[PDB]
Amino acid sequence: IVGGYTCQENSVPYQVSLNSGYHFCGGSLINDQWVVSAAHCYKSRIQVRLGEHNINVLEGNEQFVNAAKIIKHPNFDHKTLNNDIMLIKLSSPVKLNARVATVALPSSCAPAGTQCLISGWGNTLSSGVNEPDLLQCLDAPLLPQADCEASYPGKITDNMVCVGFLEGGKDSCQGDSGGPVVCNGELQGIVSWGYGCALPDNPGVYTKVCNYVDWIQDTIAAN
Amino acid sequence: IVGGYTCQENSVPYQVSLNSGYHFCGGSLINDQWVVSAAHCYKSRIQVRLGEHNINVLEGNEQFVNAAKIIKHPNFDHKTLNNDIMLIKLSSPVKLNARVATVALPSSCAPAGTQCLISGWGNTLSSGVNEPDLLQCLDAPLLPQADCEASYPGKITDNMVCVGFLEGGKDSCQGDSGGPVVCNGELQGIVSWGYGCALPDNPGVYTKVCNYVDWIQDTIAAN
Numbered sequence: 126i127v128g129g130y131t132c133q134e135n136s137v138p139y140q141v142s143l144n145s146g147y148h149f150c151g152g153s154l155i156n157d158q159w160v161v162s163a164a165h166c167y168k169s170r171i172q173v174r175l176g177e178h179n180i181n182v183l184e185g186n187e188q189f190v191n192a193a194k195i196i197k198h199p200n201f202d203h204k205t206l207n208n209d210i211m212l213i214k215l216s217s218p219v220k221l222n223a224r225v226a227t228v229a230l231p232s233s234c235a236p237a238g239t240q241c242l243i244s245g246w247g248n249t250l251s252s253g254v255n256e257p258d259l260l261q262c263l264d265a266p267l268l269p270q271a272d273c274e275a276s277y278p279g280k281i282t283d284n285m286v287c288v289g290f291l292e293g294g295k296d297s298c299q300g301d302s303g304g305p306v307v308c309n310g311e312l313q314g315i316v317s318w319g320y321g322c323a324l325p326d327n328p329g330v331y332t333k334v335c336n337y338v339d340w341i342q343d344t345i346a347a348n
Numbered sequence: 349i350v351g352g353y354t355c356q357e358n359s360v361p362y363q364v365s366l367n368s369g370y371h372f373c374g375g376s377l378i379n380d381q382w383v384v385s386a387a388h389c390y391k392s393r394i395q396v397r398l399g400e401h402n403i404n405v406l407e408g409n410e411q412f413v414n415a416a417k418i419i420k421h422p423n424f425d426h427k428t429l430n431n432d433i434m435l436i437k438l439s440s441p442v443k444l445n446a447r448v449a450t451v452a453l454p455s456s457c458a459p460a461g462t463q464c465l466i467s468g469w470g471n472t473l474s475s476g477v478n479e480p481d482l483l484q485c486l487d488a489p490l491l492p493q494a495d496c497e498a499s500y501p502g503k504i505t506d507n508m509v510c511v512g513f514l515e516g517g518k519d520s521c522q523g524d525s526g527g528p529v530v531c532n533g534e535l536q537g538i539v540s541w542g543y544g545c546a547l548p549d550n551p552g553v554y555t556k557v558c559n560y561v562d563w564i565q566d567t568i569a570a571n
């Protein structure tokens with residue numbers, strides 16, 4: 126998160142860290158045994174870390190759990206990052222409590238103008254890399270689809286939505302990938318891509334989760 | 349390397365990749381059993397990879413060797429990155445040949461105006477991160493110390509030298525760290541830090557190797 130603020134400790138209780146010896150992506154807990162993330166965060170083995178605030182200090186609320194099935198969407202295409210969404214089933218259900226909780230899936234697609242919360246332990250600079258310890262937060266609105274399209278000519282599918290500020294300064298970045306954008310209580314987007322991080326006229330683009338509620342549900346049911 | 353060109357295969361034969369399950373820093377081979385890198389690239393276990401061009405494909409000239417002693421300078425200070433230099437002794441001597449060779453240590457400090465070659469598998473973007481497969485190269489001059497000082501007020505010690513372009517566009521970046529700047533045949537600088545990557549008025553700053561020839565030699569002798 127570039128240009129964001131440090132989240133109050135465990136105020137984003139659905140946020141998870143995907144770790145393979147180091148933090149490389151984020152995700153969201155949608156029920157006690159399943160995480161949703163980006164298909165681009167695929168790796169053969171993943172340890173999911175829940176209840177985190179400081180990614181480098183054990184503060185006493187962490188639950189570390191291995192991923193048992195890691196399921197990318199059938200039609201994920203790495204060249205366009207179209208259908209960038211992946212489901213992770215945990216080896217064991219987690220114990221839900223104040224600091225580790227679920228986020229609801231969307232009842233419908235959110236309109237342009239909605240303020241959303243984006244969080245992650247991703248890069249905090251628009252140039253160079255600085256990885257933060259503490260979870261970062263950003264309040265940002267869903268952009269009009271025609272501004273998304275204007276910023277990325279020919280690259281936006283109906284499964285993508287821009288969230289951010291056309292002025293730049295504030296955006297998600299690498300390492301936030303796979304993490305949540307939640308707009309009053311429901312998961313509406315997954316961190317996916319954008320040109321640079323926090324550049325003017327280059328808002329971040331997100332996987333539009335309302336287009337996948339049926340896929341997510343069938344996949345959970347069948348697994 | 350931002351704004352650089354892909355080096356001809358094995359044209360930089362002293363360049364090594366420090367790997368701990370992934371590439372995280374560079375270094376230079378200065379004799380058949382020793383590598384010099386940045387103290388900031390310290391890790392408890394390191395595999396040194398020599399003879400590389402494509403960091404992700406085995407092309408047939410690679411030699412992978414573990415580090416036996418990893419020695420940071422006694423006075424390295426992580427807050428200012430002053431004395432950012434580290435020596436690595438390999439478990440076995442490597443076999444030197446056309447594609448794996450040594451770079452000479454400096455006979456003296458190079459003057460402002462010298463063109464140098466910088467190489468690495470570091471980040472190639474001034475905003476966001478993109479890690480390259482193929483080794484990257486950049487021709488860049490040593491800057492006047494007063495321009496270094498003007499760009500980083502109060503942060504430049506006599507053990508640092510700026511190399512780069514005040515206009516921005518071309519610079520080293522994260523992942524190049526610990527790698528070589530060679531100015532007609534001798535190692536004159538080690539990739540260390542800078543604000544951003546390739547920003548105007550923010551040239552890269554390098555560990556000034558001519559200040560450490562005696563330390564490097566005593567340390568090798570004693571180990």
Ligand SMILES: [Cu+2]
Nearest residue numbers: 165203204206
């Ligand atoms: Cu990719």
Ligand SMILES: [Cu+2]
Nearest residue numbers: 388426427429
């Ligand atoms: Cu550091």
